[PDB]
Structures are given as C-alpha cells and as structure tokens.
Design a binder for this molecule. Sequence first.
Ligand code: ZN
Length: 18
Amino acid sequence: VKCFNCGKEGHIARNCRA
DNA sequence: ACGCC
Ligand SMILES: [Zn+2]
C-alpha cells in the first residue's frame, strides 16, 4: 500500500522526505 | 500530518 504523505508506494507518511 | 501495509 501507499504512502499518503507523498502518494508514493511502500513507505510511511511520518517519515516522508517527499 | 494521520492511519494501514
Ligand atoms: Zn512519502
């Protein structure tokens, strides 16, 4: 499933570079 | 940023 911070796949919002 | 995986 996807990150929602960026909308990319296979990592977690809390930690997002974006 | 939050939640889930
Ligand atoms: Zn992300």
